[PDB]
């Protein structure tokens, strides 16, 4: 019927002054753009069809052509930046925002989807969608006593589009827009659909990725315990963005980090630090590295939760990028920890997996490890036990490697090592 | 993040 | 503000 029209046939019907021929031609254009087999986005654009599609969005008297244009434009906006720019250049933003109040839920849903694709392109279009006044009608669609009465796919599209209004960093979304959206985000964070939960956490993940004031706007809304609960979720699409958000929050002030510990996050880390998906282990160890960069009482909480053996674990065997975050976790630990805490580090066996990693080519990880070794040695003198550490480092071939690195031609590995030898190995 | 944009194929 | 914290 309307399957596999030529682009020229589609133009001939859209350029007719017959509304029904235009509807059929527009649906044919929609089916063309619905191919996952390289839809002819460009050819549709070069034919000048976007202004006609945008103008059909306002044909309230003929809701089907509103739906087919919304669908067709959605897919054009789903492509490259230039393809998205063409949809915006045709004036689609104010027309799509008008469709948010449509009495047909399937047209409203499509306009939600389309604005999500436009806002998803980047900061500028995201802020343009906001300036056109999209947030109020979007949030109004969620002003219900119970979210579960909304259609499941409708809710998912709304959450996803809201997710994109929080996304991207240069610049971050407007402060007043984030405050406007956050209460609805907080509610969606408590919904039972895992797709809504994942995209809700992704949204929180975006908002917490910035300076501490942005972190505070989220932390002040009380979402931290719920984030820690979603951290132990079964569905990996939920754990990943929940972990990025928790890890983002512990990049802030010690007080903001403490609320994450207070919510019980450290209890889930034995699983996270051994998780099979390599990216979870990297994110979890990076987060641990930023917790060990905190106060001594916070370092002590890492100790109480039995997480130091798990750091010895990731330092001994893991993806290399995970091992480098483990090195950072150790060095931050030894930079702010007490002498008793640094001695406890030795007794779970940090020293040998630390020295085996001096074998890496990565120049920055060598500075981190050498820095940690120095800090441990500094605690060894306050206990008057520097030699027993040297005997330890020599029996695992560490001293064998520490003075071999003096012939490294980055030249702080040059000297930080040579100091290490002529102060503790002479 | 997850995908910046989404195509509708149905 | 803590200087020992790190971003990705």
Range of the domain at A247: 1-426
- Whether the ω angle into residue A171 lies within 30 degrees of 0, i.e. cis, is yes
Count Cβ–Cβ pairs < 8 Å, chain A vs chain C.
Answer: 23
Distance from CA of B8 to the nearest CA of A (A): 6
Length of chain C: 8
Mark out the alpha helices in A120-170 (DSSP H runs): 123-131, 135-140, 152-165
CB < 8 Å to A121, chain B: 4-5
The total number of structural domains in chain A stands at: 1
Distance CA C2, CA A116 (A): 36
| Structure tokens, A178 | 């984030």
Classify residue A147 by its DSSP letter: G
User: Which of helix, strand or coil describes residue A425?
Assistant: coil
Contact yes or no for A263/A224 (Cβ under 8 A): yes
CB burial of A316-331 (b: ≥16 within 10 Å; e: otherwise) equals: bebeeebbbbbbbbbb
Q: Which residues of A touch C (CB under 8 A)?
A: 212, 250-254, 286, 289-290, 293-294, 328, 332, 335-336
Distance CA A95, CA A107 (A): 12
Q: Which residue has the tokens 């809701």?
A: A63
Distance CA A162, CA A220 (A): 20
Rg (CA), chain B: 8
Contact yes or no for A259/A215 (Cβ under 8 A): no
Residue of A nearest to B6 (CA): A78
Q: In sequence order, which residues have a C-beta less than 8 Å from that of residue A98 and are 6 or more positions away? A: A57, A58
Distance CA A266, CA A232 (A): 11
Helix A49-56 / helix A63-77 crossing angle, nearest 10 deg: 130
> How far is C-alpha A98 from the geometric centre of its chain's CA atoms?
31
Closest CA to A387 of A423, A349, A339: A423
Contact yes or no for A16/A26 (Cβ under 8 A): no
| Structure tokens, A378 | 């500094």
Q: In sequence order, which residues have a C-beta less than 8 Å from that of residue A77 and are 6 or more positions away? A: A83, A84, A87, A88, A92, A114, A117, A118, B5
Distance CA A44, CA A15 (A): 14
| Structure tokens, A171 | 């610049």
Helix A413-424 / helix A386-395 crossing angle, nearest 10 deg: 120
CB < 8 Å to A332, chain C: 4
Q: Which residue has the tokens 């798990």?
A: A310
Distance CA A325, CA A336 (A): 17
Distance CA A202, CA A196 (A): 10
Contact yes or no for A327/A315 (Cβ under 8 A): yes
User: Which of helix, strand or coil describes residue A1?
Assistant: coil
Q: In sequence order, which residues have a C-beta less than 8 Å from that of residue A97 and are 6 or more positions away? A: A111, A115, A129, A132, A133, A134, A137
In terms of phi and psi (left: phi > 0; alpha: psi -120 to 50; beta: otherwise), the region of A102 is beta
Distance CA A213, CA C1 (A): 11
Distance from CA of C8 to the nearest CA of A (A): 8
Q: Which of A34, A164, A167 is closest, CB to CB, to B10?
A: A34
Distance CA A329, CA A387 (A): 25
How many Cβ atoms are within 10 Å of A394's Cβ, its own excluded? 14
How many Cβ atoms are within 10 Å of A154's Cβ, its own excluded? 16
Length of chain A: 426
Distance CA A380, CA A389 (A): 7
DSSP class per residue in A218-247:
HHTTT-HHHHHHHHT-S-HHHHHHHHHHHH
8 Å CB contact of A113 and B8: yes
Q: How far apart are the first and last CA of chain A?
A: 89
Mark out the alpha helices in A34-80 (DSSP H runs): 41-46, 49-56, 63-77
Contact yes or no for A316/A279 (Cβ under 8 A): no
- Chains B and C are in contact, defined as 3 or more C-beta pairs closer than 8 angstroms: no
Q: CA angle, corner A88, sides to A82 and A89, nearest 5? A: 80
Q: Which residue has the tokens 């001695």?
A: A343
Helices (runs of H) and strands (runs of E) counted in chain A: 28, 0
Listed resolution, Å? 2.7
8 Å CB contact of A121 and B10: no
% helix, strand, coil for chain A, step of 5: 75, 0, 25
CB < 8 Å to A35, chain B: 9
Q: In sequence order, which residues have a C-beta less than 8 Å from that of residue A20 and are 6 or more positions away? A: none
Contact yes or no for A248/A211 (Cβ under 8 A): no
Distances (CA, A) of A24 to A3, A67, A106, A267: 10, 12, 18, 59
Q: CA angle, corner A310, sides to A309 and A316, nearest 5? A: 90
Helix A278-291 / helix A308-316 crossing angle, nearest 10 deg: 130
| Structure tokens, A388 | 């027993």
| Structure tokens, A35 | 């191919």
Rg (CA), chain C: 6
8 Å CB contact of A336 and C4: yes
Method: X-ray
Closest CA to A6 of A49, A36, A65, A56: A49
Q: Which residue has the tokens 């060894």?
A: A380
Q: Which residue has the tokens 């436009």?
A: A118
Distance CA A198, CA A118 (A): 21
B-contacting chains (≥3 CB pairs under 8 Å): A
Distance CA A187, CA A259 (A): 20
Distances (CA, A) of A403 to A332, A394, A399, A425: 24, 11, 6, 10
CB burial of A259-269 (b: ≥16 within 10 Å; e: otherwise) equals: bbbebebbebb
Distance CA A91, CA A104 (A): 22
Distance CA A70, CA A288 (A): 46
Residue of B nearest to A70 (CA): B8
Distance CA A311, CA A376 (A): 16
Classify residue A319 by its DSSP letter: -
Q: In sequence order, which residues have a C-beta less than 8 Å from that of residue B5 and are 6 or more positions away? A: A77, A78, A79, A84, A116, A117, A120, A121
């Amino acid at each position: 019927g309307t399957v596999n029209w030529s682009v020229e046939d589609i133009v001939k019907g859209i350029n007719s002054n017959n509304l029904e021929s235009q509807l059929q031609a527009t649906q044919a254009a929609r089916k063309l753009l619905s191919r996952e087999k390289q839809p002819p986005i460009d050819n549709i654009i070069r034919a000048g069809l976007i202004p006609k599609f945008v103008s059909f969005l306002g044909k309230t008297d003929c809701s089907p052509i509103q739906f087919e244009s919304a669908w067709a434009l959605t897919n054009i906006a789903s492509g490259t930046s230039e393809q998205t720019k063409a949809v915006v250049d045709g004036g689609a933003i104010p027309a799509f925002i008008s469709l948010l109040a449509s009495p047909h839920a399937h047209i409203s849903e499509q306009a939600v989807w389309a604005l999500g694709n436009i806002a998803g392109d980047g900061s500028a279009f995201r802020d343009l969608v906001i300036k056109h006044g999209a947030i109020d009608p979007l949030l109004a669609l969620l002003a219900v006593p119970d979210l579960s009465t909304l259609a499941c796919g409708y809710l998912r599209n709304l959450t996803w589009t809201l997710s994109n209004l929080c996304r991207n960093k240069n610049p971050a979304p407007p402060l007043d827009a984030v405050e406007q959206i956050l209460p609805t985000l907080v509610r969606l964070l408590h919904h039972n659909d895992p797709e809504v939960l994942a995209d809700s956490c992704w949204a929180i993940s975006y908002l917490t990725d910035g300076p501490n004031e942005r972190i505070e706007m989220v932390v002040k809304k009380g979402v931290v315990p719920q984030l820690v609960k979603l951290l132990g979720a079964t569905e990996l699409p939920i754990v990943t963005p929940a972990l990025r958000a928790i890890g983002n929050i512990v990049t802030g002030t010690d007080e903001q980090t403490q609320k994450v510990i207070d919510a019980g996050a450290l209890a889930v880390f034995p699983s996270l630090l051994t998780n099979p998906k390599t990216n979870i282990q990297k994110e979890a160890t990076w987060t641990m590295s930023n917790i060990t960069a905190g106060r001594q009482d916070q370092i002590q909480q890492v100790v109480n939760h039995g997480l130091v053996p798990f750091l010895v674990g990731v330092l001994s065997k893991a993806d290399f990028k995970t091992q480098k975050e483990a090195a950072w976790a150790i060095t931050n630990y030894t930079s702010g920890g007490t002498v008793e805490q640094i001695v406890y580090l030795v007794h779970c066996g940090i020293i040998e997996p630390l020295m085996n990693l001096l074998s890496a080519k990565d120049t920055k990880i060598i500075q981190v490890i050498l820095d940690a070794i120095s800090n441990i040695f500094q605690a060894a003198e306050k206990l008057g036990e520097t030699e027993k550490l040297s005997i330890m480092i020599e029996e695992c071939g560490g001293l064998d490697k520490i003075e071999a690195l003096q012939r490294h031609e980055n030249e702080s590995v040059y000297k930080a090592s040579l100091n290490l030898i002529e102060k503790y190995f002479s | 993040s997850n995908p910046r944009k989404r195509h509708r194929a149905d």
